[PDB]
Design a protein around this ligand. Structure first.
Ligand SMILES: Nc1nc2c(ncn2[C@@H]2O[C@H](COP(=O)(O)OP(=O)(O)OP(=O)(O)O)[C@@H](O)[C@H]2O)c(=O)[nH]1
Ligand SMILES: [Mg+2]
Lengths: 570, 198, 142, 180, 415, 10, 18
């Protein structure tokens, strides 16, 4: 096997050498450690056949870090191949030189890189630009010593739009890792030159060209107007990533645009069709499009005001897309499409995703809390869902009712009777505690509040700390409101939570309640049963400082995770 | 009448999990169609395929009445298949074993030693809180017999009943008296286990 | 008594399953998945004994397909291994050079043998020839 | 296609038919089934489950599945409705207190949308004591004439002797079979 | 900014991997499978995984997961675009996407992976262009990639200049269970199969609402496409200036333009379904289909999928027109019709039994979807005006195009 | 394969 | 013939718009 392969590779027949190379490639792909034969393949490296040269280069790149010492026998071959008349061989050699992760190997490759920097072949120019970026990433100090920054800067001002885009991408990557010192920013002339080559760049070249504009900060409206006019055609590209980059560039430029001018209105009108087109993309890019819409939603929410039908999740939509659709609908919820949102949420509650059902319940509750005009409709939907006889749905409806009561309890007295008997046997801590809190705060429209609390007092000492605290608060409120039918209940609760309750916070709360009861029952109404102020809901909008930074970071990993760019990298 | 071996080979030929689920559903459709027709000839093959599918992780709620119908059958293969189905897909929380009490009682006095042993093993494996109440009398009757191959089964049934019904142990005190001279190792082991459980 | 006995393969496929405890189907599936994950994530020098959920989860596979047992904390541990070895020997004698392919094909026979060997988690046949003779006689009945 | 084989089979008798056995416990259902199948009154314990048997008469195999009348077994009659074409009801005229319960059970079972093609087959069991009612008083009490789209026939059979069983079988054959 | 794009298999085995930056160890692929299993078993599975500080973005292919690991905050959209381009290239080069070809053409696969992208920056994406430098059965790279025209190879000669266009219509209807249609969007598709000599520059002209309004002819039937996306060969500047559709057509079948706008017209097919499902006794399928399309048009290969019960068995079909077959694999009844003339009304009455034992868990209510496809029908009314075929040498072109109307996201919510 | 191998190899 | 609508000849430009 290994010995036979070595003997075959140490022969003078090209027919057996090709078969040996193919077998070695298959073994490495099959998961075989063929790095022990790396020195043997070194001798059979300088071959006229192009097929074996690529395999040898791939083996060396994959067997370079494993055997760095044995890689010293490949500099001469690379130097010889760096001047081959065939452009493909030169491009392959340039790619392989940068792929070798050898500290002592990149030192001797500077001369070939300098020679190929002025390569006439546009593919050769792109390969040299990639090799320079790889060398700078491997050794920034070596790249600075070689003085390749000037050559990379001069590359953008030459012919070959693909090579120009590659050089711009390499410069951006180098500046991305750089400490912002000696930045490669260019004046309006460079931006105009790049825009002139934007219509000639390839699908990949368009992204590289638009990435440079993401760093430039416009200072004049005329320049911003021209940039917006040039980026407007980018919205009609079949490449979704190019569309995303163009949208990010337009959003970044909109931070300096004047709302008085008509350019902003035209840009807003031309952005909605692009969002609609992006929303119907592949499932992999659907999540990216949703994340981009959510990030840009908090900046200019008036653009997608009329885009509501497309926000509905499809039957074959993925779980991640279904989850994002609900968030998009919640962010874009308005009183105009309140009925449509309620109908979609009602349809979304009949699915089989338990997580999907919980997300739908949370979205319905958020929509009801945000808009008080549909509070009655939300209450009716919650009552219907509770009548749906769904355990998870029942808990979700109980939680939604408890949340709604604390927010808009002025006209919530008509649902206590319906919720008084709604199968209270559920033991969910999030639902039982919410029901107890609702009963305690709303202990006026129910004539059998004491009887209902009796069933929950059987295991109060071992139910839960939050549940125990909520039950104690409800008992105290009931005693303060109606003490004739709950005079013994308050004493029993105090005895159970003060003597048999070992919780420190619960014990302290029980002691405070007992002291208040024994001090002045009249003052307890104004102290315990007081009118709480308006509840400040947690704003889901991101901070304005973070929103502006996320605007520049469009299409990167930080947009999907909704985290700062420095808060997610290692 | 697709044999269990053919179904196993077909399942082994499936690659994708979705493909396996589709094949399982395709077989279950034919199984349900055969069951709805009240088929009695190839019922053993359908029962085996359903048991294999249930072990594979597919729903088998519809294949409960067929097991009950086959349990009260007369063929030995059908009786074995029904006993296996009751032991596997029948449970106390299932609630479908309530009707099986009459079948167990009918098979409790069967002359064949294989049907009675299979029924005793099934009752022990699926001992319920209510089945043992109506089956405690029959267990004690077989405990005083001289069948060596059945003494161990009777002891196991008594132990299972005692574990399921701790209040029924009072009826087993006089049944196990004077049983320490059993020559067979199985009967002696069963008696020792019953005494330890008591 | 043995709460459950399940024959699972190395890749995770289960070739046998016999639980003596009445549990919900979803709960039983979750317990089986957890047991497979624990066994599949265990080394060869773990002693083949696990106290999972206060249950003596004993795993000892003599081939690619593994075997598991779940007994309460009231008896010795080596007894379970001896019983498993005896059951494997009886199955091999009944079949003859038992392999993984024949185990799937002889699932009904394997279930019948397990029922005739151990009932309710307790040992039912102490001898090895009496059980084999009884199984052969039952099979010959038709 | 050809149906020559079906005609050849039917030349000597091919139709089999089915039957059901429902009613309250201790209503003579087990004894009646034993008499129909064997021809003797066999003493049996209460039917915890059910009894399944077949009887060959008039070239028709009338399969009979006994169903108990236990409180826990009362709601189990829906399982036997599947693949069921006939049904025989056994009444207990000697239980005045249980007569209302039996009537309510019959009404509940008769209110199933799946059981529509099965005609009424009422068997007057315990027709040996002086307290037993006639063939019309029981029907009037049960309101058999108010069963729309139900072909009901009242027959009185004595469990000890067996008189009237042949008449009931002939009536069932005439109601089910519509040929010469 | 993916660190390495790899091709996995359904059992977790990596069919092929190719590092581009080297910032991530190749051993991280082993932890991808357990993470995916945990996410799927907990519902947290997403295409972009995350193993600590390295994100493992993968997409589900025909048989393997195209996992592309990355370490920094690279362009996720760029990675997705590169993966889509690679998938298209593989489909063009390999007719099948399975393990049979992954392990069969690795010699050319390694070269294609090396040439496509370098250092995380994709460089080559033209499948036809890539086929001129990388073949499985090498010369210098073509000048077309270096030249501006990377979508029209020069020097191509053909005996005839025939281009086959395709007016593909996508009828997507979202009818709720209440009977109202919520999402009714029609997506146009102008795909042409160009086979000519040279590098012709197509000059497309159609009956667009915006173009007619600009020219002053905004009074006839003109299509007002909400979203119009040109292909790569389409010049953005010409369309932005005066809606001038001038671009160099590629060699072969390609998608030039794809209209996308909402529809305010009645559905082509009106399907009314009834469910007389007895409580564990039987079920009724009162399915009524009304063809709202023009009577002169026929819907060929109409397959109205009606979801039957999950545990339903012994079905009986009482229909009027069209064959009905119950497929247990899909767990639904397909109202199959060979040809459905416009205005037809087919009535069906399904009837099957149900097991006595109730199901332990619910199965949901999947929407009813039809597979109608009526060609030679233009519901949107957009009419192609002219296609400016100009060649430097000069030739008489004979373009061809066909209008096909099919059923897209035409789902009907169940009751 | 590994499945045709004997469980105990006896 | 061909399913999906027969191929039809197309013009070169809008002759009515000059
Ligand atoms: N003496 C006498 N008793 C009868 C007669 N007919 C019915 N019975 C009583 O009815 C009971 C019915 O017993 P079976 O027929 O064996 O069983 P069943 O009718 O299905 O009743 P269950 O098993 O309890 O559901 C008997 O125990 C008798 O006491 C009869 O003609 N004479
Ligand atoms: Mg009886």
């Amino acid at each position: 096997e290994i010995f036979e392969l070595k003997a075959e590779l140490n022969s003078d027949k090209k027919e057996k050498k090709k078969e040996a190379v193919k077998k070695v490639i298959a073994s490495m792909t099959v998961g075989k450690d063929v790095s022990a034969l790396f020195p043997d393949v070194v001798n059979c490296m300088q071959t006229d056949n192009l097929e074996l040269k690529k395999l040898v280069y791939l083996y060396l790149m994959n067997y370079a870090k494993s055997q760095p010492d044995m890689a010293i026998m490949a500099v001469n071959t690379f130097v010889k191949d760096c001047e081959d008349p065939n452009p493909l061989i030169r491009a392959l050699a340039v790619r392989t030189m940068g792929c070798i992760r050898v500290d002592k190997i990149t030192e001797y490759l500077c001369e070939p890189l300098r020679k190929c920097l002025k390569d006439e072949d546009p593919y050769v120019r792109k390969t040299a630009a990639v090799c320079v970026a790889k060398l700078h990433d491997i050794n920034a100090q070596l790249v600075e010593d070689q003085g390749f920054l000037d050559t990379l800067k001069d590359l953008i001002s030459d012919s070959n739009p693909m090579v120009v885009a590659n050089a711009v991408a390499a410069l951006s990557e180098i500046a991305e890792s750089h400490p912002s010192s000696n930045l490669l920013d260019l004046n309006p002339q460079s931006i105009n030159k790049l825009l002139t080559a934007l219509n000639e760049c390839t699908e990949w070249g368009q992204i590289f060209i638009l990435d440079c504009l993401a760093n430039y900060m416009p200072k004049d409206d005329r320049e911003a107007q021209s940039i917006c006019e040039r980026v407007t055609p980018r919205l009609s590209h079949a490449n979704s990533a190019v569309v995303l980059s163009a949208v990010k560039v337009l959003m970044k430029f909109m931070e300096m645009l004047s709302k008085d001018l008509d350019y902003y209105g035209t840009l807003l009108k031309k952005l909605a069709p692009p969002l609609v087109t992006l929303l119907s993309a592949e499932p992999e890019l659907q999540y990216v499009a949703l994340r981009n819409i959510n990030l840009i939603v908090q900046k200019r929410p008036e653009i997608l005001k009329h885009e509501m039908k497309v926000f509905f999740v499809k039957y074959n939509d993925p779980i991640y897309v279904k989850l994002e659709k609900l968030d998009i609908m919640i962010r874009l919820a308005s009183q105009a499409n309140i009925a449509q949102v309620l109908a979609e949420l009602r349809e979304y509650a009949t699915e089989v995703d338990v997580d999907f059902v919980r997300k739908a319940v949370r979205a319905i509750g958020r929509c009801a809390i945000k808009v008080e005009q549909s509070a009655e409709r939300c209450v009716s939907t919650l009552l219907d869902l509770i009548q749906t006889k769904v355990n998870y749905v029942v808990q979700e409806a109980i939680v939604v009712i408890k949340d709604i009561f604390r927010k808009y309890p002025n006209k919530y007295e008509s649902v206590i009777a319906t919720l008084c008997e709604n199968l209270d046997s559920l033991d969910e801590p999030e639902a039982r505690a919410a029901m107890i809190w609702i009963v305690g705060e709303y202990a006026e429209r129910i004539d059998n509040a004491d009887e209902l609390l009796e069933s929950f007092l059987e295991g109060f000492h071992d139910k839960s700390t939050q549940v125990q605290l909520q039950l104690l608060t409800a008992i105290v409120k009931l005693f303060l409101k109606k003490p004739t039918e709950t005079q013994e209940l308050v004493q029993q609760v105090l005895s159970l939570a003060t003597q048999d309750s070992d919780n420190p916070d619960l014990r302290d709360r029980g002691y405070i309640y007992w002291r208040l009861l024994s001090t002045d029952p009249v003052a307890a109404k104004e102290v315990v049963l007081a009118e709480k102020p308006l509840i400040s809901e947690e704003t889901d909008l991101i901070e304005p400082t973070l929103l502006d930074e996320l605007i520049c970071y469009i299409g990167t990993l930080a947009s999907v995770y909704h985290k700062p760019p420095s808060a997610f990298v290692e | 009448p697709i044999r269990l071996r053919e179904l196993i080979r077909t399942i082994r030929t499936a690659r994708t999990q979705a493909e396996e689920r589709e094949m399982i559903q395709k077989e279950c459709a034919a199984i349900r169609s055969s069951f709805r027709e009240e088929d009695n000839t190839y019922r053993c093959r359908n029962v085996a395929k359903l048991l294999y599918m249930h072990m594979l992780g597919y729903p088998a709620h519809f294949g409960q009445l067929e097991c009950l119908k086959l349990i009260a059958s007369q063929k030995f293969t059908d009786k074995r298949i029904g006993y296996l189905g009751a032991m596997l897909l029948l449970d106390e929380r299932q609630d479908v074993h309530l009707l099986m009490t009459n079948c167990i009682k009918n098979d409790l006095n069967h002359s064949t030693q294989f049907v009675q042993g299979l029924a005793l093993c099934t009752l022990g494996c699926m001992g319920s809180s209510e089945m043992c109440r109506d089956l405690a009398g029959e267990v004690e009757k077989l405990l005083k017999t001289s069948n060596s191959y059945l003494r161990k089964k009777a002891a196991l049934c008594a132990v299972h009943v005692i574990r399921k019904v701790p209040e029924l142990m009072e009826m087993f005190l006089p049944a196990t008296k004077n049983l320490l001279n059993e020559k067979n190792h199985g009967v002696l082991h069963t008696s020792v286990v019953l005494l330890t459980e008591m | 008594m043995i709460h459950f006995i399940l024959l699972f393969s190395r890749q995770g496929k289960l070739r046998l399953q016999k639980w003596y405890i009445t549990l919900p189907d979803k709960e039983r599936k979750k317990i089986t998945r957890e047991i497979v994950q624990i066994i599949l994530s265990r080394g060869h020098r773990t002693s083949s004994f696990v106290d999972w959920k206060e249950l003596k989860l004993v795993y000892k596979r003599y081939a690619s397909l593994y075997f598991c047992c779940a007994i309460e904390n009231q008896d010795n541990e080596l007894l379970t291994l001896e019983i498993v070895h005896r059951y494997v020997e009886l199955l091999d004698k009944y079949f003859g050079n038992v392999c993984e392919l024949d185990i799937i094909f002889n699932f009904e026979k394997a279930y019948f043998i397990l029922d005739e060997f151990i009932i309710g988690g307790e040992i039912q046949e102490t001898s090895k020839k009496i059980a084999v003779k009884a199984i052969e006689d039952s099979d010959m009945l038709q | 296609g050809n149906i020559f084989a079906n005609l050849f089979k039917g030349l000597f008798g091919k139709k089999e038919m089915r039957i059901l056995m429902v009613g309250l416990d201790a209503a003579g259902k087990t004894t009646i089934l034993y008499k129909l199948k064997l021809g003797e009154i066999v003493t049996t314990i209460p039917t915890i489950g059910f009894n399944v048997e077949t009887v060959e008469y008039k070239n028709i195999s009338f399969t009979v599945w006994d169903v108990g009348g236990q409180d826990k077994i009362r709601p189990l009659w829906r399982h036997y409705f599947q693949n069921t074409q006939g049904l025989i009801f056994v009444v207990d005229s000697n239980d005045r207190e249980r007569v209302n319960e039996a009537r309510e059970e019959l009404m509940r079972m008769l209110a199933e949308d799946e059981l529509r093609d099965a005609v009424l087959l009422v068997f007057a069991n315990k027709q040996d004591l002086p307290n037993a009612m006639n063939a019309a008083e029981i029907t009037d009490k049960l309101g058999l004439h108010s069963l729309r789209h139900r072909n009901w026939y009242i027959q009185a059979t004595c469990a000890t002797s067996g008189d009237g069983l042949y008449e009931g079988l002939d009536w069932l054959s005439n109601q089910l079979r519509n040929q010469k | 900014s993916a660190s390495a794009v790899y091709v996995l298999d359904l059992k977790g085995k990596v069919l092929i991997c190719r590092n581009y930056r080297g910032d991530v160890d190749m051993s991280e692929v082993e932890h991808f499978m357990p993470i995916l299993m945990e996410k799927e078993e907990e519902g947290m599975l997403s295409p972009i995984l995350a193993h600590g500080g390295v994100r493992f973005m993968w997409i589900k292919h025909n048989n393997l997961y195209l996992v592309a690991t990355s370490k920094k905050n690279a362009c996720v959209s760029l990675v997705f675009s590169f993966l889509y381009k690679v998938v298209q290239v593989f489909s063009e080069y390999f007719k099948e996407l399975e393990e049979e070809s992954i392990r069969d053409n690795f010699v050319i696969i390694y070269e294609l992976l090396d040439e496509l992208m370098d250092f995380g920056y994709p460089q080559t994406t033209d499948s036809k262009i890539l086929q001129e430098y990388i073949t499985q059965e090498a010369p210098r790279p073509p000048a077309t990639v270096t030249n501006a025209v990377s979508w029209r190879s020069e020097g191509i000669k053909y005996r005839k200049n025939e281009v086959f266009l395709d007016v593909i219509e996508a009828v997507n209807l979202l009818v709720s269970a209440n009977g109202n249609v919520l999402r009714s969007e029609i997506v146009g598709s102008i795909k042409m199969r160009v086979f000519l000599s040279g590098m012709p520059e197509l000059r497309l002209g159609l009956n667009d609402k915006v173009l007619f309004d600009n020219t002053g002819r905004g009074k006839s039937k003109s299509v007002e496409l909400e979203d119009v996306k040109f292909h790569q060969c389409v010049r953005l500047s010409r369309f932005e200036n005066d809606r001038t559709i001038s671009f160099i057509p590629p060699d072969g079948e390609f998608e030039l333009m794809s209209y996308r706008l909402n529809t305010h017209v009645k559905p082509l097919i009106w399907i009314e379904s009834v469910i007389e499902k007895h409580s564990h006794s039987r079920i009724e399928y009162m399915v009524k289909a009304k063809s709202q399309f023009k009577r002169r048009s026929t819907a060929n290969n109409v397959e109205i999928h009606i979801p039957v019960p999950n545990d339903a068995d012994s079905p009986k079909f009482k229909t009027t027109v069209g064959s009905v077959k119950w497929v247990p694999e899909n767990s639904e009844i397909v109202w199959s019709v060979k040809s459905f003339p416009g205005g037809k009304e087919y009535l069906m009455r399904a009837h099957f039994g149900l097991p006595s034992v109730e199901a332990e868990d619910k199965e949901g209510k999947p929407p009813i979807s039809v597979k109608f496809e009526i060609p030679y029908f233009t519901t949107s009314g957009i009419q192609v005006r002219y296609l400016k075929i100009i060649e430097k040498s000069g030739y008489q072109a004979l373009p061809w195009v066909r209008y096909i109307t099919q059923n897209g996201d035409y789902q009907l919510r169940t009751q | 394969k590994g499945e045709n191998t004997s469980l105990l190899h006896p | 013939d061909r399913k999906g609508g027969s191929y039809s000849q197309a013009a070169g430009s809008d002759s009515a718009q000059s």
